[PDB]
Structures are given as C-alpha cells and as structure tokens.
Design a protein around this ligand. Sequence first.
Ligand SMILES: CCCNC(=O)c1ccc(S(N)(=O)=O)cc1
Ligand SMILES: CCCNC(=O)c1ccc(S(N)(=O)=O)cc1
Ligand SMILES: [Zn+2]
Length: 257
Amino acid sequence: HWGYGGHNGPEHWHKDFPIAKGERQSPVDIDTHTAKYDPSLKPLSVSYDQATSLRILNNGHAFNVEFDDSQDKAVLKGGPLDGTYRLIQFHFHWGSLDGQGSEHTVDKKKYAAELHLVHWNTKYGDFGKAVQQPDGLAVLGIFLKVGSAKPGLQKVVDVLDSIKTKGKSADFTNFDPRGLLPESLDYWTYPGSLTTPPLLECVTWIVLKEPISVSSEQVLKFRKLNFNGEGEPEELMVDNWRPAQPLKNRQIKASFK
Ligand SMILES: CCCNC(=O)c1ccc(S(N)(=O)=O)cc1
Ligand SMILES: CCCNC(=O)c1ccc(S(N)(=O)=O)cc1
Ligand SMILES: [Zn+2]
C-alpha cells in the first residue's frame, strides 16, 4: 500500500493511481513573483464558531481531527468559492527536520509543516459525492514555522501519545480550530487535487500567506507518532509530504496586492 517509505513513496503512486501524472495535481510551488493579484477575489469567510470536533485518529499517514459535518456548523465560504463548504477534518504534513515538511512551497521555500483544513461543497450532499466533482472540496492550507509555541495547538499535541500507532483513535471534543489560524487571511488560490491517493482533482486550494509559529517541542511531538500499527516494527511518522507537482495549465491568484 502507498506511503512515504523507502519503496512506496510519492514517486511510486502513479502505478496504482495514474492521475498522479494528471493536469491538476497538488501541491505546487507558489512563485510569488508570478501569482497575480485578482481584485475579483473576495475575503475568505471562515465561520468556525459552531465547530464540533469529535475524535482524533492516526490513519497510518497522518492524524485527522474529525468534525461533525451532518449540518452547517463550521463552514468556509467566500474567497474564490461559490456556495458553502463544510469542515470535515483537519490534519498536518511535516518533516523529519525543520527545513522540510510542507507540501506547498513558496518560491521553493519548504516550511516545517502544513495544516490542511478540509471542507466539502454541500451542493453535492455528502463527502463521497463531493470528491467526484471538480469543485467538490476546498482545502485551507496554513504553513507552520518553528519559533514560539502555538497555544491553540497544545491540546492536539498532548493527545498524540494516546494515538501513537495506526488505527488508534481518541475522543477529541470541544477543540476550537480557530486557535490554529494566523492573524491575516490573505491567500493564494488555484485548482488542484488531493495530495494523497486517490489524488482526485476535486480541490480548490486556498493557501494562506502568513504562517503560524509552533515551538520546536510541539513539532517534535508530531515526529514521535508512528506510521505502523501497534506491535509492528517502529517507523516514525515523519516526512509525510508529497513534493511539488507541475503547475501545467494553471494560474495561481493572490487575494492581496
Ligand atoms: C481560545 C480557543 C482557540 N480560539 C482562538 O484562539 C480564537 C478564537 C476566536 C478569535 S476572534 N473572535 O478574535 O476572531 C480569536 C482567537
Ligand atoms: C478520498 C479518500 C480519503 N482522502 C481524503 O479525504 C483526503 C485526501 C487528501 C487531502 S489533502 N492532503 O489534499 O488535504 C484531504 C482529504
Ligand atoms: Zn493534507
């Protein structure tokens, strides 16, 4: 099965998932000199006041914080988007060292990690239908750099010891994802894909310009997770990022001047 190891990593995925070589793959490098301001783009509307987190799960490739998405509670609207997108889960990608870990890059700079807040377009009724549509998902991507601690991340870090291995989950209620958002909502946007198999070309990417700061101790705890299941040979969950893919016939638009 696919992964990030020595023999099943991103360069192998195309054998089982040929869309890996498609026209709309993610992530990409964001060339800040070529992305053009688009005065038609609106401010993002992030409405997380009513978010209901439920559970945290180590799925063998990352950990997902899952939300109740059975009604419009936490939603993303505005920006480049038409209609309403409901938050279903967030997760991160991160490195073995601070100098790598993000999926998107900015002028080729890799950040220590990247947070993905995943939302689906409610006009398609359920998530599984949305991933089959070119405008099915909106993923809000936020870079992490190592510096001061992020207070709103600590609840996540402290539960990680309880979900060390693949297939473990823990209850995770009452977590407020607003504590993971930088000050500014300036962004870049482009049409792309899921960055893990099945690599479906169903995502409107919204990547915030301003990174959040997390401490070295916080990220170190991410790196103590395991890709493997309980009892199996230990493989630290690090470097679970796909590198940048060809931009092809796409334009990256900026929300800011
Ligand atoms: C404290 C739990 C995690 N939440 C936050 O950090 C947070 C929430 C709302 C706003 S506000 N209302 O200023 O846009 C700012 C911060
Ligand atoms: C469809 C099979 C389950 N996969 C997902 O739901 C999914 C995959 C990648 C991303 S990402 N890393 O592009 O935010 C978000 C969601
Ligand atoms: Zn992701």
